Amino acid sequence: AGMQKQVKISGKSKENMSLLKHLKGDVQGKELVIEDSIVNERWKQVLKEKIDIEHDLFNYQKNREISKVPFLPVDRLITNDEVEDILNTLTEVLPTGKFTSGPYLEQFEKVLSTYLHKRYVIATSSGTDAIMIGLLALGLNPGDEVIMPANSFSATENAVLASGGVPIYVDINPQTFCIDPDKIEEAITPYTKFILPVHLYGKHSDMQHIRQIANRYKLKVIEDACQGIGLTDLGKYADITTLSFNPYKNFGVCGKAGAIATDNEELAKKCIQFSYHGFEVNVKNKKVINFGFNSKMDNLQAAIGLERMKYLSLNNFKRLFLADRYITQLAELQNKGYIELPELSEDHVWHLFPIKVRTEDRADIMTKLNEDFGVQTDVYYPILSHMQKTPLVQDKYAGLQLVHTEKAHSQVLHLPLYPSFTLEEQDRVMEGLFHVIKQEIG
Amino acid sequence: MQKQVKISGKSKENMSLLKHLKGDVQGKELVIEDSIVNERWKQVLKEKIDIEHDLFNYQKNREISKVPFLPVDRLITNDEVEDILNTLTEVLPTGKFTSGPYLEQFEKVLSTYLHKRYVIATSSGTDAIMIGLLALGLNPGDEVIMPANSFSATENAVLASGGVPIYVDINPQTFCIDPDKIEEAITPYTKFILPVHLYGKHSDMQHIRQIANRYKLKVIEDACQGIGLTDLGKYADITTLSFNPYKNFGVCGKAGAIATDNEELAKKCIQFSYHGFEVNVKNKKVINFGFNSKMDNLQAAIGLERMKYLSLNNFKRLFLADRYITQLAELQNKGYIELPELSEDHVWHLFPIKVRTEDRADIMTKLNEDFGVQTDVYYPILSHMQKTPLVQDKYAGLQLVHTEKAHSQVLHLPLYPSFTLEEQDRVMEGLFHVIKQEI
Ligand SMILES: Cc1ncc(COP(=O)(O)O)c(/C=N/[C@@H]2[C@@H](O)[C@@H](O)O[C@H](COP(=O)(O)O)[C@H]2O)c1O
Ligand SMILES: Cc1ncc(COP(=O)(O)O)c(/C=N/[C@@H]2[C@@H](O)[C@@H](O)O[C@H](COP(=O)(O)O)[C@H]2O)c1O
């Protein structure tokens, strides 16, 4: 065509896939359109010139000796430039004395509203609190059943249990690690009120199919997107979307925080009431519901968030590049049936990078990677919900079998992946994996 | 032979220091206890200290047209900001903002300060109370006897975790729960007493403990406004604190703490505070559920700096309270207002006087309109008078005579550590002028 298609840089997952192809190419010109959003701020300087990803984004030093590769060194999750930006904003915020309530809260919620294309955003004190408040705002009563997967971080089930709800675990798709929509309908009872899909590891659940089931059975859908910021069409089919801004997330602040996003005004109002003591919105000390929590995000953290968010599109792109590099360079191990690699799909933001290895070999693979090559791997998370050793599980969740969740749980292995990870470290992870796995198979 | 004046920063010793420094000498040698809370005291405490000049930099003639009740920009000093920026310069590059090493250090210093074996730092005072109740074994429907004049957070912590507030009347002089009204409210469903050290005044904890022991009840105290009280926690199973930035000691965000001497109880608090996980074993739950309610490492680093100001600030608050009580004496002597008692068991988070029910609205308006003096009433609506379905279904018809009367009379005057004596002069002269014009 004589007509150049524009590449809209929104920083979202689907658009990042296109950007990946383009930034791998030679011509990087006017067709690359940076959307005027805070999330793209760090792209502005970077894209002034033609980019070589390996050198310009990763400072690839193939010849730098690597003797150990930590899975997630938290000191490297925040860059020197971020620290400088944060110290700068705190120099202005601290003398204001406004650390809990304050003006940065509304600005941060407004920026999120625009980014998520959701009318209302209520910033909370954590992702866990976002889920708990969202459930209550949606009308959860004690005993109401909430269909959910058993392989999320414990926060998901805790938010349900703390709100008085009853988790009903259903099996996952063992390739995507997300709730299998084909298993949801089987679990529905007259007590079911909610479906709580989790976009685990940053992979988008099958939300259209989930919404079809929810509509058929008049269920509400609250999605745990705490690991999924940047996903294209996040929240399209959900009544409530929840986010975490914990410092290890794709976008985080410097403490605990999260958010609830919704298009529904009455639901938003109820979220605000539950997030702040049950008070009438913007009228302190006057309760209009039975009770509420002390769970708004702090103004100080919102100010920090407005700085760290400037790095989000670039960071999510770097995560995608890393994931693409693992998938391509480890290809042979999957072609020969030794491992499973995730699919390079547009509906993933690569918070964690899961491969699957043989159940019988995983412990040895992890040990050998660490002992022989100093490569640290991990398994998020070590214990499934229905296998936790608690009185509730012992008393009520006995006899529950989730065949696919249990099998995938025994196979999954997470490889290091975060935006400041180096390609030379990634080289060592991959070479170590090739060496160890060929030792496993004989 | 020299008697020593020990400076601990706690309320009883502050009262002794006040008397000593006002020329009623309690001894010879000033001895500052080597505690974190006393660090900033060391910069200004000298043998011949002039409190008005050395601590308040009294500028009698400074031009003032407004006296805000609580300007939050003044609740944090330039020196605090400097200390905080310096600590954050070191914390930020560590990348440790939630879990981290300053947490344990902050808990340890609080443990030493409070003389409590175990301290669990939480994400707010509200969460401290909620977690404490759950750790003490609160089940849905269990009743918690408490006053109705606290901030809504107190009842909210009970209600959130399944509990049932049972409101009893206060002592209308102290604003604290009346221990003589507790026994009559006890039912087979009562498991807790939750006294509140309202405005910084210590509840009658020995009497509350006597009742609790008699009825086998647990005592969890809301001391969210009471940090610095002598013998805080002596008769409580759990003590809760808030480090909200407006408190006598606060951080730069939400935070709180639970303190207890009981190890198994502390273990349950830690479990509930962090996802129900085994203590220090992430991802392995040992109780049914938990919250994400630990204090952030970043705020703990900040608290380790701001706490250096606590003893000095609490003393400044006491000096201000004493100045109000002394200078407004005539208005009480002639029956126009009631002043709080100058007692050792107060840390003066808020300064409540009482005025006539019929005149309070006019007094507040005239102070503001005529003199630019802002006052306030903490808090505007009592628990059993909130317009919620629960109140209509359960607390309708409830009559708390002393609480409701005191609630209609209380007026809080500006009082915070960085408040100036020249502003306080304006508050006091304004009050005289407004009362006198009413007569
Ligand atoms: C799917 C999902 N839903 C919900 C949540 C809840 O989101 P917050 O409530 O915002 O955490 C999470 C959070 N997960 C991380 C967890 O991966 C681990 O790294 O531990 C950190 C905690 O580690 P620290 O305590 O060290 O911060 C948690 O933040 C989550 O992953
Ligand atoms: C007796 C008692 N128990 C318990 C609590 C609960 O303590 P947190 O959960 O730590 O707040 C409190 C807290 N009270 C203050 C409140 O006075 C008001 O200033 O509003 C601020 C909040 O105002 P901002 O939202 O602007 O910070 C609250 O911190 C309390 O006072």
From Swiss-Prot, chain B:
What reaction is this protein's catalytic activity? 3-dehydro-D-glucose 6-phosphate + L-glutamate = D-kanosamine 6-phosphate + 2-oxoglutarate
**GO MF terms on file?**
pyridoxal phosphate binding; transaminase activity
Pathway(s): Antibiotic biosynthesis; kanosamine biosynthesis
Q: Which of this chain's residues are annotated to bind pyridoxal 5'-phosphate?
A: G125, T126, Q225, S242, N292
| Necessary cofactors | pyridoxal 5'-phosphate
The UniProt entry, under Pfam families, shows:
DegT_DnrJ_EryC1, NtdA_N
Q: Does the keyword Transferase apply?
A: yes
On induction, the UniProt comment says:
Induced by neotrehalosadiamine.
InterPro entries recorded: DegT/StrS_aminotransferase (IPR000653), NtdA_N (IPR054367), PyrdxlP-dep_Trfase (IPR015424), PyrdxlP-dep_Trfase_major (IPR015421), PyrdxlP-dep_Trfase_small (IPR015422)
Report the enzyme's class at the first EC level. transferase
Enzyme Commission identifier(s): 2.6.1.104
Record bears the keyword Lipoprotein: no
- At which residues is N6-(pyridoxal phosphate)lysine found? K247
What does the record list as GO biological process?
Answer: antibiotic biosynthetic process; polysaccharide biosynthetic process
Q: Which residues bind substrate?
A: T98, S99, F151, N244, P245, Y246, Y274, K282, Y379
Further details from the record? The production of neotrehalosadiamine is dormant in the wild-type strain. A mutation in the beta subunit of RNA polymerase activates the production of the neotrehalosadiamine.
The entry's family comment says:
Belongs to the DegT/DnrJ/EryC1 family.
**Quaternary state and interactors:** Homodimer.
Q: What is this protein called?
A: 3-oxo-glucose-6-phosphate:glutamate aminotransferase
Species this protein is from:
Bacillus subtilis (strain 168)
Its gene name is ntdA
